[PDB]
C-alpha cells in the first residue's frame, strides 16, 4: 500500500484552525470597516454639499430595447462581386432562366 | 482512497473527519485479509 | 418683527442639539467614529468597546443665504456610562465648517443613536 | 530535493514502529514520475476506471 502526501506542507502550520480563522477574521473585519468608514463620509458629503450637486454628477444609464430586423441579405461592393465568380460569366446565363 | 489531513482539526464537519479517518484501515486490511490480489490501496491526502 | 428681511449680513441662530446616547458594540462600530474628525477623546487609547456614549451638542450657525450656511460649528463633551450610571467626560465633539449646507454632526448622531428626551409622559392625561 | 528537506509532494513508508514517515526514495520516485509526465505526458492506454 502507497501513501502520498499531496498536502502542500500545510502540516507543518501550527494551531491551523485558529489560524485559518484568523486570516478570515482580518480580511472580513478591513472590507466591513473599510465600507462602513466610505458610506459615511459619503453621507458627511451629501450633508455638507447639499445632495443637489451631486444629483448632477451620476451619470445616466441606457437600456438596450428590441429593433427586429428583416435581416436582408447583405450586397457587397461589385467589386468584390465580380471576385467571386469568374469573369466570363458576365451575360452567359440567360437569367430568364 | 481520498484521505484527509485534517481529522476533526476544523470546526463542525459533521461525520467527515470520522468517515476519512476510518479509509485509513485498508493500509493494514490490506496485508491481514485476503483480497491483496484483487485491490491494492493508493491513499491520497488531498490538501488545499 | 413681521415683513421681508434679506439681513442675513447680520443673521445667527444658536441652538441646543438634544442628547444623543450610543451603544458601542462592536470594532467596525469604534473605527467609524474615529473615521470623524470631530470625535475627539482625551487618550485616544481609551477602550470604546462595550462601552455607552453620550453627545451634548451644541451647534452654532451663521446664515448668509436663503438656504445655505455660512458657517457651522458644532461642540459638546463627550461622556461615558459608569457602572454607578453616571456619565463623565471622554472627550469633544469639535465641529467647525464654512460654506456649510446641513450639520453632519447631528445628521450622523441621529441615523446612528437614539435621542433621550428629558420628556416622559403620563398613561393618560390627568385632568386637574 | 535538498538534504533534509522534504518536498511539497511525496510518499510516504510506515516504520516497523508504525508511524507513516516521508522516505526519500519513494518521493523521488513519485517526483520523478510527475517531471517524467510533464515533459512526455502519460497514456492511460488500455486502462479501466
Known amino acids: 500500500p502507497v501513501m502520498?502526501?499531496?498536502?502542500?506542507?500545510l502540516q507543518f502550520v501550527p494551531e491551523l484552525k485558529e489560524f485559518t480563522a484568523k486570516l478570515r477574521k482580518e480580511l472580513v473585519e478591513t472590507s466591513e470597516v473599510?465600507?462602513?468608514?466610505s458610506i459615511e463620509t459619503a453621507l458627511e458629503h451629501k450633508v455638507v454639499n447639499g445632495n443637489s450637486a451631486d444629483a448632477a454628477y451620476a451619470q445616466v444609464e441606457i437600456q438596450p430595447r428590441a429593433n427586429i430586423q428583416l435581416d436582408f441579405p447583405e450586397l457587397k461592393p461589385y467589386?468584390?462581386?465580380?471576385?467571386?465568380?469568374?469573369?466570363?460569366?458576365?451575360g452567359l446565363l440567360d437569367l430568364e432562366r | 482512497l481520498p484521505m484527509s489531513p485534517n481529522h476533526g482539526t476544523f470546526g463542525g464537519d459533521g461525520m467527515y473527519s470520522e468517515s476519512k479517518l476510518?479509509?485509513?484501515?485498508?493500509?493494514?486490511?490490506?496485508?491481514?485479509?485476503?483480497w491483496a490480489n484483487q485491490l491494492t490501496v493508493c491513499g491520497a491526502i488531498i490538501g488545499w | 418683527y413681521r415683513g421681508n428681511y434679506t439681513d442675513f449680513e447680520n443673521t445667527f441662530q444658536k441652538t441646543v442639539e438634544p442628547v444623543y446616547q450610543m451603544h458601542i458594540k462592536t470594532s467596525k462600530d469604534i473605527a467609524v467614529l474615529r473615521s470623524k474628525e470631530w470625535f475627539q477623546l482625551d487618550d485616544e487609547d481609551f477602550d470604546l468597546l462595550n462601552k455607552t456614549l453620550t453627545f451634548e451638542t451644541e451647534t452654532e450657525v451663521t446664515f448668509k443665504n436663503a438656504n445655505i450656511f455660512s458657517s457651522v460649528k458644532c461642540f459638546g463633551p463627550i461622556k461615558v456610562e459608569l457602572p454607578t450610571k453616571e456619565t463623565v467626560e471622554i472627550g469633544i465633539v469639535d465641529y467647525e465648517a464654512g460654506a456649510s449646507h446641513g450639520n453632519p454632526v447631528v445628521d450622523f448622531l441621529k441615523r446612528n443613536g437614539s435621542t433621550l428626551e428629558q420628556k416622559v409622559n403620563l398613561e393618560n392625561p390627568i385632568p386637574i | 530535493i535538498p538534504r533534509e528537506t522534504i518536498?511539497?509532494?511525496?510518499?510516504?513508508?510506515?516504520?516497523?514502529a508504525g508511524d507513516w514517515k516521508y522516505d526519500r526514495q519513494l518521493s523521488s520516485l513519485f517526483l520523478d514520475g510527475l517531471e517524467k509526465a510533464a515533459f512526455n505526458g502519460v497514456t492511460f492506454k488500455d486502462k479501466y476506471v
Open chain 1, 4 to 9: 502520498a502526501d499531496l498536502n502542500g506542507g
Open chain 1, 34 to 37: 473599510r465600507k462602513a468608514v
Open chain 1, 79 to 90: 467589386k468584390q462581386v465580380k471576385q467571386i465568380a469568374p469573369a466570363e460569366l458576365e
Open chain 2, 22 to 34: 476510518s479509509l485509513e484501515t485498508l493500509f493494514n486490511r490490506w496485508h491481514s485479509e485476503s
Open chain 4, 7 to 16: 518536498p511539497f509532494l511525496h510518499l510516504r513508508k510506515k516504520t516497523p
